Amino acid sequence: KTRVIYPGTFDPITNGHVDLVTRASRMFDEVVVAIAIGHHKNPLFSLEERVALAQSSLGHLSNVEFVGFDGLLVNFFKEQKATAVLRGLRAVSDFEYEFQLANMNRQLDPHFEAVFLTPSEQYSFISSTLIREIARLKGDVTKFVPQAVVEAFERKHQQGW
Amino acid sequence: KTRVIYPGTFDPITNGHVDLVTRASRMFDEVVVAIAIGHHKNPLFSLEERVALAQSSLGHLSNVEFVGFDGLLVNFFKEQKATAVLRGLRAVSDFEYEFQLANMNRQLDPHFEAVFLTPSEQYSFISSTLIREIARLKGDVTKFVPQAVVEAFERKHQQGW
Amino acid sequence: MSKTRVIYPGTFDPITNGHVDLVTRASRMFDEVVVAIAIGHHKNPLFSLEERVALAQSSLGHLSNVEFVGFDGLLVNFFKEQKATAVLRGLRAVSDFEYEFQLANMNRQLDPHFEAVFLTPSEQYSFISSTLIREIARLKGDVTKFVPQAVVEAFERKHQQGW
Amino acid sequence: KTRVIYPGTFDPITNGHVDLVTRASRMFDEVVVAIAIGHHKNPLFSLEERVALAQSSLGHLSNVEFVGFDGLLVNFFKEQKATAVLRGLRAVSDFEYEFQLANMNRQLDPHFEAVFLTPSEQYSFISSTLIREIARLKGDVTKFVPQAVVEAFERKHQQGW
Amino acid sequence: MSKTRVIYPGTFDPITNGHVDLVTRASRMFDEVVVAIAIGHHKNPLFSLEERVALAQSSLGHLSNVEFVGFDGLLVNFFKEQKATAVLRGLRAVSDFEYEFQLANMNRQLDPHFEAVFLTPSEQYSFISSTLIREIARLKGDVTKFVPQAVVEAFERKHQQGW
Amino acid sequence: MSKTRVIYPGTFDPITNGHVDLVTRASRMFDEVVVAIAIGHHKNPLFSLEERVALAQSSLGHLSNVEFVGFDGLLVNFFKEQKATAVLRGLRAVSDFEYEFQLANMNRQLDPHFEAVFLTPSEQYSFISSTLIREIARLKGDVTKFVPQAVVEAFERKHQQGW
């Protein structure tokens, strides 16, 4: 009966994401992990890699689906017959940005709803962007991401980056 | 199956509160409007007045309950067998304060969960504190609060304040 | 009638070099500036309204387009009554920013002609607030660098009277 | 006697900008809408398109001028014999950034002045960046921008986009 | 004379695991750490200065380079009098950041040798403040997770005396 | 008891009077200060690492307890390798505060001996950043007031090479 969309680029997925989806999966009937294609600010990982890292890391949660999308979030929301979008709020900048996005999307669709979760303290600092930068300098990201993501970074090293 | 607590002093309740509870009531099975007694500070309205203003303004939502409590949120959460506490985030200060509270409460109870909603833009400026100050100076608060609250302010003038 | 009139409200308890800088700056871009000293409904001020108005006059009376007036009650009613074009406030930090953002929206809801314009303090006055200044002077610290001469003297008088 | 500069990229202009300039035009003798060329982070619209969209949307205000400039704001300020620069403050990040810029520019020119306006709540969520992204995905931006901007987005679709 | 002495000032009403963590961390990088308990001028603390000093000693006395001292008056005079190298403060959140930024600049204006260094609390103590702890204990909530044992006991005593 | 060694990391592209003030202040309270110039992994710097190290030496070489060293960005490994007692960062604004709070917690998770201490810039340098300075110089604005002489000259060299 409740269906919530958790959208993002997931480039890559992290333990922070895993925690939020886990927590969301306990309070909503269905959680859709929605991987935006990444219209510019080109992702490190391909959509397919990202979807696959998401499935590996969260496939054990039986009420979680994994889907790529390309489009406006608000149309994806309507098309999915979602009850709400869920986003994480790590810091003040996230708070301001999402506040605005929620109001804009509610203007595009009056049934739009956005609910927010606050990360658990042990994952508070984690973002895909930070993780990419640390891995790009061959820092160890083992503590912050699933095993499959560590391996995908190793592959990326043996290739260009 | 989902039961969420919406705690606050509601002194008085405002159109902002009404909007958040309405929105919450559409995505959870049960919403408990939990009016903290507030003997930290002293409220303008008695708990009984506040409960009554809450019932009048939200009693039309059939899945909403109204209950007074002491303030020790994590015990109330356990006692109510709640799935989460819901809070509004009007501004950055709310964001920081609730972030900390959520982490503290999760430390007291690992099943604690806190979800957040962002007010729509037409209610973003409204707070009970602001409303009290305007009404205390006989400003018109009709646009920002339910009719019963306007009347309760008029009664408070004919008595005191 | 094309003329601008702006209200600069606050408790001014006491006025500081920060306030003086903002009013000076405001006085160059608006025809009239009203320094509006809120009476101080609770959180009782150190200085009486009359002392505060007098310290404001001493420190800014040289600006011929500045008026000094006490008020009580709702800012938005004071705005209407004064036929103001805008209220001016200083923004020292993020908390000021959030609070004034909200107040402006609320007051615009009470009166659609309401307007609020903001100034940001220059760096040499960014750390100064009346509250800080009071606490330092109360402990006989030297506030000479941060306030006008008349304010230094009014603090000395306050000491000789038992603060 | 007062001349205020309102600088930005205006890519495109929005109802937010229109509201700020309208408000500014009531309290200053002259308002200069100053469209920065857009030194990298290349704009969607050419400077000429942007100036033209600004004229169409604000030309009804008889005390408003429209002028393209390079970014070097403090030189533009001197050259224009401006009394102040006016900026909008949408969020805390804007607040911090403009605070610093004002202090830096005052250090470069002691006559420099910066005054700020806060957007009314119905335009608080609108930014050119958000509007571009929605229009790029053929979302309807009619509610948030002038008619000429809707048309300029349609032209951009029939070309690029 | 190459030796560092840092002052950690506050009301400590009561001391918490947050404070304990900061002082512990400070004690590893400075030769001397002075826990400086402000008397609480019209801050009306729950605990007496003597109780507060004693709760500080119990909770931190195992750190051999930490001293415990009450003070009243201006922080900057206490700094000079103690021949401190710096004052140390915690920063839990943005509001703390802004407030301390301003205080540091003001105190540097009063004394050019003044210095203020900041620590950020470890994640498990990030939410903890004396004010929060008081409010929870006042409503008979369990504060055992957030404060030393002696503080739990001092709250129990305060309850048996009417709290 | 043991000697203090603090790392001050950044890109220093270029160094500014703000940096100079922080390092000067740091040098008075720690035995050793390592100015650690991160190579600049993408978002490519205007100045080469070698230019940047040399501008740092010129501007701070008079402080006898300051070293200048280039490193890759992996701060926590550099910390271990240098046997540092702490990393020092400046906090100019709220955004810096949030970002560094998170980084400190992450690095403490990677290494439990990691420590981060913060300084707040004095008000006369609060507005200065390398990023702002670059943009002003790129548009031939005068940056003489905000950076050491050697940096003014390095910008002039960059102009004579077509920038």
Side-chain angles (χ1 to χ4, degrees):
Chain A
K1 183 151 205 81
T2 61
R3 185 167 184 74
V4 308
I5 302 306
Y6 184 38
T9 40
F10 301 86
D11 182 38
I13 192 175
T14 74
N15 295 355
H17 293 105
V18 168
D19 196 51
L20 292 191
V21 62
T22 301
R23 285 163 54 200
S25 80
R26 292 187 205 114
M27 52 194 313
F28 298 112
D29 299 308
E30 299 166 356
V31 177
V32 187
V33 174
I35 312 211
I37 203 114
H39 45 261
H40 315 97
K41 185 41 262 299
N42 90 119
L44 182 53
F45 296 102
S46 67
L47 181 51
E48 293 76 17
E49 287 166 324
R50 291 181 278 146
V51 171
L53 294 164
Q55 284 153 168
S56 28
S57 325
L58 294 168
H60 69 278
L61 300 172
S62 65
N63 66 161
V64 178
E65 298 155 47
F66 306 95
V67 64
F69 81 117
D70 72 307
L72 276 175
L73 194 266
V74 75
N75 290 342
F76 190 66
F77 176 94
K78 289 162 207 228
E79 156 169 48
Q80 291 281 133
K81 311 177 284 155
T83 36
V85 170
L86 169 61
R87 294 286 277 159
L89 297 178
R90 264 182 333 271
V92 165
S93 55
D94 304 37
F95 177 66
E96 296 192 308
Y97 185 60
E98 292 297 347
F99 189 106
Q100 293 343 54
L101 268 49
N103 281 338
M104 172 58 82
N105 289 324
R106 204 172 294 105
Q107 222 56 274
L108 298 173
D109 179 5
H111 304 308
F112 189 82
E113 187 56 274
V115 307
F116 302 102
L117 253 34
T118 238
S120 324
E121 72 196 43
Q122 74 263 55
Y123 313 116
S124 294
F125 54 87
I126 296 174
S127 78
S128 302
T129 285
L130 221 215
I131 290 304
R132 284 199 306 280
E133 103 171 67
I134 295 158
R136 184 133 201 59
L137 304 161
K138 63 272 318 93
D140 181 25
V141 299
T142 290
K143 309 267 266 98
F144 317 129
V145 302
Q147 187 54 37
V149 177
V150 178
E151 290 158 0
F153 273 126
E154 178 186 310
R155 286 194 297 280
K156 206 66 65 172
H157 281 122
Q158 274 150 204
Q159 300 167 4
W161 132 302
Chain B
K1 187 138 90 281
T2 60
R3 184 169 183 73
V4 308
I5 131 283
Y6 184 38
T9 51
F10 301 87
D11 182 38
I13 96 290
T14 75
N15 293 355
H17 292 105
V18 168
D19 193 54
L20 291 188
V21 180
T22 301
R23 284 163 58 195
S25 80
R26 292 183 194 117
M27 52 195 303
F28 297 113
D29 300 309
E30 299 173 346
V31 177
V32 184
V33 174
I35 313 207
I37 300 253
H39 47 257
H40 146 98
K41 194 98 312 303
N42 87 123
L44 189 253
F45 295 103
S46 67
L47 180 53
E48 295 71 21
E49 287 165 327
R50 291 181 279 145
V51 171
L53 294 165
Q55 285 155 166
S56 317
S57 48
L58 295 165
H60 69 278
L61 300 168
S62 66
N63 67 160
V64 180
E65 299 155 44
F66 308 94
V67 64
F69 80 118
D70 83 302
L72 219 189
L73 194 267
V74 71
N75 285 345
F76 190 66
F77 178 92
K78 292 156 167 183
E79 153 198 331
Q80 291 283 133
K81 311 201 77 169
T83 37
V85 55
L86 187 138
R87 295 285 279 152
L89 298 175
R90 164 185 312 99
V92 165
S93 274
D94 304 316
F95 176 67
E96 295 192 296
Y97 186 58
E98 293 298 346
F99 190 100
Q100 292 174 44
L101 269 49
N103 282 338
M104 95 103 183
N105 288 323
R106 205 172 294 107
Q107 226 174 269
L108 299 171
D109 180 5
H111 305 306
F112 189 81
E113 187 57 274
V115 307
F116 302 102
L117 252 39
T118 238
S120 47
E121 70 269 358
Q122 75 263 50
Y123 311 118
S124 51
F125 59 85
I126 297 172
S127 79
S128 303
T129 287
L130 234 189
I131 291 304
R132 284 197 303 277
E133 224 346 312
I134 293 159
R136 170 68 140 63
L137 302 162
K138 63 273 317 93
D140 182 26
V141 300
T142 289
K143 292 163 96 257
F144 317 128
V145 301
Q147 189 53 36
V149 177
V150 180
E151 290 159 359
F153 274 127
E154 184 47 289
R155 285 195 298 280
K156 199 69 62 176
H157 281 124
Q158 90 197 156
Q159 298 167 4
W161 194 62
Chain C
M1 225 80 253
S2 61
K3 317 338 270 198
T4 59
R5 183 171 184 75
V6 308
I7 302 305
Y8 184 39
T11 52
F12 301 88
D13 182 38
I15 192 177
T16 75
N17 293 355
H19 292 107
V20 167
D21 192 56
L22 292 201
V23 182
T24 301
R25 285 176 329 112
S27 81
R28 296 178 187 120
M29 52 193 22
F30 298 113
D31 299 303
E32 301 178 340
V33 178
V34 187
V35 174
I37 312 207
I39 204 116
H41 45 260
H42 315 97
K43 186 41 263 299
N44 267 240
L46 181 52
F47 295 101
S48 67
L49 179 53
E50 293 76 17
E51 288 166 327
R52 291 180 278 147
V53 170
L55 293 165
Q57 221 140 194
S58 318
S59 47
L60 294 166
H62 69 277
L63 301 172
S64 65
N65 71 158
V66 182
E67 298 157 38
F68 309 94
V69 64
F71 81 117
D72 185 55
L74 221 49
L75 187 44
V76 296
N77 292 342
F78 189 66
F79 177 92
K80 189 163 254 209
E81 154 197 329
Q82 290 282 134
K83 311 185 81 204
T85 36
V87 304
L88 165 66
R89 295 285 276 158
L91 294 178
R92 266 206 349 270
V94 165
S95 55
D96 305 315
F97 176 66
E98 239 85 69
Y99 185 60
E100 293 297 346
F101 190 103
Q102 175 190 178
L103 267 49
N105 282 338
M106 171 59 76
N107 288 322
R108 204 172 297 106
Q109 221 57 276
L110 299 173
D111 180 4
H113 305 306
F114 190 82
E115 185 57 274
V117 307
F118 303 101
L119 253 34
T120 238
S122 45
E123 70 269 356
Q124 76 263 50
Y125 310 118
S126 51
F127 58 85
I128 297 172
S129 78
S130 303
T131 287
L132 235 183
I133 290 302
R134 285 197 303 279
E135 226 332 79
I136 294 159
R138 193 185 79 65
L139 303 163
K140 64 272 317 95
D142 182 26
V143 298
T144 289
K145 294 216 276 271
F146 317 127
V147 302
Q149 189 53 37
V151 179
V152 180
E153 291 158 0
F155 274 127
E156 182 53 39
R157 285 195 298 281
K158 200 64 68 173
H159 282 122
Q160 91 199 157
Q161 300 166 1
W163 192 265
Chain D
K1 182 152 268 78
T2 61
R3 184 168 185 72
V4 308
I5 299 170
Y6 184 39
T9 53
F10 301 88
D11 183 37
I13 191 173
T14 74
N15 294 355
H17 293 107
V18 169
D19 193 53
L20 290 194
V21 301
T22 301
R23 285 163 60 193
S25 81
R26 293 183 193 115
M27 53 194 324
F28 297 112
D29 300 310
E30 301 168 352
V31 176
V32 187
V33 175
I35 314 207
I37 205 114
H39 45 261
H40 315 97
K41 185 41 262 299
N42 267 239
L44 182 51
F45 295 103
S46 67
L47 180 51
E48 294 75 18
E49 287 166 325
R50 291 180 278 146
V51 170
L53 294 165
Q55 286 153 167
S56 318
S57 47
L58 294 166
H60 69 278
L61 300 170
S62 65
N63 67 160
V64 181
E65 296 157 47
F66 308 93
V67 64
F69 80 118
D70 82 299
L72 205 248
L73 194 265
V74 74
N75 284 358
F76 188 67
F77 176 94
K78 190 156 215 141
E79 98 168 39
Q80 290 281 134
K81 312 201 79 204
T83 37
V85 304
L86 170 57
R87 296 284 277 158
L89 294 178
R90 264 206 305 100
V92 294
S93 53
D94 305 317
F95 176 68
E96 55 164 298
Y97 185 60
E98 292 297 347
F99 190 102
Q100 173 185 198
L101 267 49
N103 282 338
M104 172 59 87
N105 289 325
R106 203 172 297 105
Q107 222 64 269
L108 299 173
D109 178 7
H111 304 308
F112 190 84
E113 186 56 276
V115 306
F116 303 100
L117 254 33
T118 238
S120 47
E121 70 269 357
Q122 76 264 50
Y123 310 118
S124 51
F125 58 85
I126 297 172
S127 78
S128 303
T129 286
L130 232 195
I131 290 306
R132 285 197 303 278
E133 227 331 79
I134 294 158
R136 192 197 198 283
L137 302 162
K138 63 273 317 93
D140 181 26
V141 300
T142 289
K143 299 253 261 87
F144 318 128
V145 302
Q147 189 53 39
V149 178
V150 179
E151 291 158 0
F153 275 127
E154 281 153 320
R155 285 195 298 280
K156 201 65 67 173
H157 284 305
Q158 91 197 155
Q159 215 198 12
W161 256 199
Chain E
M1 226 81 284
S2 60
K3 316 310 206 264
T4 58
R5 183 170 184 75
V6 308
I7 297 172
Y8 183 40
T11 52
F12 300 87
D13 182 38
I15 191 169
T16 75
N17 295 355
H19 293 107
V20 170
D21 196 51
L22 291 186
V23 299
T24 301
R25 283 163 60 208
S27 80
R28 294 185 200 115
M29 54 176 34
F30 299 113
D31 300 304
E32 299 173 347
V33 174
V34 185
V35 174
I37 312 209
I39 204 114
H41 175 97
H42 193 97
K43 204 222 225 280
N44 263 240
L46 184 52
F47 297 101
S48 67
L49 176 275
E50 292 76 18
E51 287 166 328
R52 291 180 279 146
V53 171
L55 294 166
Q57 287 205 175
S58 316
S59 324
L60 295 167
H62 69 278
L63 301 167
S64 66
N65 67 159
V66 180
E67 303 157 36
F68 308 94
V69 64
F71 81 116
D72 81 298
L74 275 181
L75 193 265
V76 75
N77 290 341
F78 190 66
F79 176 94
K80 185 178 301 92
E81 157 201 329
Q82 291 283 131
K83 312 199 83 169
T85 130
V87 169
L88 188 138
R89 294 287 276 164
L91 296 174
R92 265 181 298 105
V94 166
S95 53
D96 305 315
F97 175 68
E98 294 201 298
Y99 185 59
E100 293 295 351
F101 188 107
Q102 293 341 124
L103 268 49
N105 282 339
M106 175 54 87
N107 289 324
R108 204 172 295 106
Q109 222 54 276
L110 300 172
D111 179 5
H113 304 307
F114 188 81
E115 189 55 276
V117 306
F118 302 102
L119 253 30
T120 239
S122 325
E123 72 211 37
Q124 74 262 55
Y125 314 116
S126 53
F127 54 89
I128 294 173
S129 79
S130 301
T131 284
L132 222 214
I133 290 305
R134 284 199 305 280
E135 228 327 82
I136 295 158
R138 185 154 76 235
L139 303 162
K140 63 273 317 91
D142 181 25
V143 299
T144 290
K145 296 194 98 92
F146 317 129
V147 302
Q149 191 53 38
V151 177
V152 179
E153 291 158 359
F155 273 126
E156 281 156 356
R157 286 194 298 279
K158 207 68 62 172
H159 281 123
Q160 90 198 156
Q161 300 166 3
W163 175 229
Chain F
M1 188 62 180
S2 194
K3 125 152 104 89
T4 60
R5 184 169 183 74
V6 307
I7 297 171
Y8 184 38
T11 52
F12 302 87
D13 182 38
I15 192 173
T16 74
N17 294 355
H19 293 107
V20 167
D21 196 53
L22 265 28
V23 180
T24 301
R25 286 202 284 152
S27 80
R28 294 181 192 119
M29 52 175 43
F30 298 113
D31 299 308
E32 300 173 347
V33 178
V34 184
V35 176
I37 312 210
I39 205 114
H41 46 262
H42 325 103
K43 192 301 160 214
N44 54 314
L46 183 49
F47 296 102
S48 68
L49 181 52
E50 293 77 17
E51 287 167 325
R52 291 181 279 147
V53 168
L55 295 164
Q57 208 133 183
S58 315
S59 314
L60 295 166
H62 69 277
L63 300 169
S64 65
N65 68 160
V66 181
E67 300 160 36
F68 309 93
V69 64
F71 81 117
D72 82 298
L74 222 187
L75 194 265
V76 72
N77 286 347
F78 191 66
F79 177 92
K80 188 172 306 97
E81 156 201 329
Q82 290 282 133
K83 310 158 74 179
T85 37
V87 305
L88 188 138
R89 296 285 276 154
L91 299 173
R92 164 182 10 264
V94 34
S95 53
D96 304 316
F97 175 67
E98 298 195 299
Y99 185 59
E100 292 298 347
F101 190 104
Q102 292 177 50
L103 268 48
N105 282 338
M106 95 103 184
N107 288 324
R108 204 172 295 106
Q109 225 170 273
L110 299 170
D111 179 6
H113 304 307
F114 188 82
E115 189 57 273
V117 309
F118 302 101
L119 253 35
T120 239
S122 48
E123 69 269 357
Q124 75 263 49
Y125 310 118
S126 51
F127 58 86
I128 298 171
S129 79
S130 302
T131 286
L132 231 195
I133 290 304
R134 284 198 304 280
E135 227 330 80
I136 294 159
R138 192 187 77 69
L139 302 162
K140 262 261 223 265
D142 180 25
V143 299
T144 289
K145 295 287 299 96
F146 318 128
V147 301
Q149 190 53 39
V151 178
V152 178
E153 291 159 359
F155 275 126
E156 185 53 40
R157 286 194 294 279
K158 208 69 66 175
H159 282 124
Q160 153 95 195
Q161 301 166 9
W163 172 83

